[PDB]
C-alpha cells in the first residue's frame, strides 16, 4: 500500500537503533565492543542473556566481525539481527 | 517492557507468516507470494516487480537449499540485503 508497511517500519527501526548505539564512541558508523554490549543488554533483553563478562563480548564480536577491524558495521549488525530473529522463530515451532 | 528492536524483529516474523501462509506450503514463500510481499510491503524501498524474470532471479538468489521456495532463514537474508542497501542510501 501507500502507507509505510509494518515491514518497512521494522527496517527503519533497525537502522535507528544501530545509529543510536554506534554514535556514542569513536566511529559513529560502527559498534565497538563497548557499544555492542550496551545494545544487547538494553534492547535484546528478552531474547538474549545479559552480558556482564568480558570474555563473552570478545567472542560475540569475533564471530560478527568479518572484515577484521574489531568492530561491527551495519552490514555485520544486520547479519546478527538475522541470526537472532531466526532463533526466536525456531523457538515458535 | 519490550523494545523497539525486538518489536521490529517480531514484525518480521509476522510479515513472513502472513505471506507464506496464503498459498501452497503455509511455511514457505513461493514466487508469487514473494512477489506480492515485495509489491505490497516494500513499495517505498524497491521498484515494483512486473516481470516474471525478475521474480525468478530474486528467488534463485534467495533460495539456498534448492527447493524453489523461500523459508524464514532465506527471507531474513533478504531483509538483511535490502535493509543494508537502504541504509546506504539514507
Amino acid at each position: 500500500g501507500s502507507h509505510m508497511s509494518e515491514l518497512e517500519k521494522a527496517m527503519v527501526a533497525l537502522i535507528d537503533v544501530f545509529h543510536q548505539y554506534s554514535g556514542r564512541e569513536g566511529d559513529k558508523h560502527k559498534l565497538k565492543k563497548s557499544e555492542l554490549k550496551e545494545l544487547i543488554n538494553n534492547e535484546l533483553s528478552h531474547f538474549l542473556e545479559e552480558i556482564k563478562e568480558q570474555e563473552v563480548v570478545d567472542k560475540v564480536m569475533e564471530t560478527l566481525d568479518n572484515d577484521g577491524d574489531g568492530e561491527c558495521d551495519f552490514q555485520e549488525f544486520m547479519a546478527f539481527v538475522a541470526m537472532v530473529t531466526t532463533a526466536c522463530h525456531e523457538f515458535f515451532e | 517492557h519490550m523494545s523497539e528492536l525486538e518489536k521490529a524483529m517480531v514484525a518480521l516474523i509476522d510479515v513472513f507468516h502472513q505471506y507464506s501462509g496464503r498459498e501452497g506450503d503455509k511455511h514457505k514463500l513461493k514466487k508469487s507470494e514473494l512477489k506480492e510481499l515485495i509489491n505490497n510491503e516494500l513499495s517505498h524501498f524497491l521498484e515494483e516487480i512486473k516481470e516474471q524474470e525478475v521474480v525468478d532471479k530474486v528467488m534463485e538468489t534467495l533460495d539456498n537449499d534448492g527447493d524453489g521456495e523461500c523459508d524464514f532463514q532465506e527471507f531474513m537474508a533478504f531483509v538483511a540485503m535490502v535493509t543494508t542497501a537502504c541504509h546506504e542510501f539514507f
Partner: peptide
Amino acid sequence: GAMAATYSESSILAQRRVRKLP
C-alpha cells in the same frame, strides 16, 4: 521515490540462557 531495481557458539549461548517461568 528512491528505489533500487531489486538486483541488489556465543548466540546459542545467549539463547540457551533464556530460561525462566517457575
